Symmetry: D2
Subunit: 115 residues, 4 copies
């Protein structure tokens, strides 16, 4: 599992469950091509987005649908989504965990990169 | 001044100075069109991006060039940039401050919306 | 004004208004003695805590009463308070801003130290 | 394992390894009594601090020795430590994960509380 996403809810102190995540990869013509998508589990984690073979070098965009998360809980949030854009695998394959911490008017995102 | 951007550096404990910031507004055909841009000042702030007349309701993207900031300091960063995407909504007088707190492998962003 | 405190509310996207803040200085016997205190203003800021003459080198604790803030908003919080503990060091002219970003189950704090 | 601590390094995008953590519990005379201590592993996690039987109701302080962490990496940080203070088990036993995200001049802490 070379790409994992973990999302927490800073209002409830809980995993953010059922958060939709869409991953895109920049194509040779500079457009964002759809790459993988999924939703966070009861643990706030999303595994199985991609494989070592498919997850080649490139610029990737991880779009976390924070607005739909808050709206489903009856909350009108500020952001449309949280976007995380990064070059991956430039020095060979790595494992990436993209974490996000959500509040209605704020979020944080951190990358943990391991070899 | 209905839209301000403030950027802080969590490694040096300082304003993030001379950071390029580009603002886009979502067009009818779902493309991002340039709206305003600048570089943060010595206080990490970018004022005068738009005016009340120009800053109508819609979806805006604030792209902060974090990668160039870290590279100018000789520090290896994770993200290509930090993106903040939000809907501006008219509900009484509103001023939007988009704050960002930068680390090489993490950032947070918060919206301070006041009257 | 060598020491300022700024507090933001990540749930409402606003300054955190009327938050009690207590500053302590570490005494010779390793106890915390009261040094300054106040409540944040309508802009979430607390100025005028100390003076250059009084704010000598040493270890300081800034205790932010986050629990009372959330309870006044009818929101259930995790922490008893947020504590920020740091050494003030004289290396040229220095101004310290202690910023805090509050959510019910999470907070961040950053030091902005400028000349 | 009713109390776990996880620490990440926002400069390196890595677990924060070998971070000392000291836990205290407020005694009946209002002093902070030592409760448990440990260090984070190669994964940035600290397990085994306490047991369900020992981890009774109370006010707990989790002190994360961030300064020694940064100093051992050759970095002079701002904070002495990161303190996390909370009432535990008030509505019956819960499992607490205290996460911290470290930068030299900033940190965040979040609590994930599960039943
Ligand atoms: Ca390459
Ligand atoms: Ca009880």
């Amino acid at each position: 599992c070379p790409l994992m996403v973990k999302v927490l809810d800073a209002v409830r102190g809980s995993p953010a469950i059922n958060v939709a995540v869409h991953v895109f990869r920049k194509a040779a013509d500079d457009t964002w091509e759809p790459f993988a998508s999924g939703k966070t589990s009861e643990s706030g984690e999303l595994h199985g987005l991609t494989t070592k073979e498919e997850f080649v070098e490139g610029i990737y965009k991880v779009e976390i649908d924070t607005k739909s998360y808050w709206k489903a809980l009856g909350i009108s949030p500020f952001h449309e989504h949280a976007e995380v854009v990064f070059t991956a695998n430039d020095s060979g394959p790595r494992r990436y965990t993209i974490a996000a911490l959500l509040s209605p008017y704020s979020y944080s995102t951190t990358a943990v990169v391991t070899n």
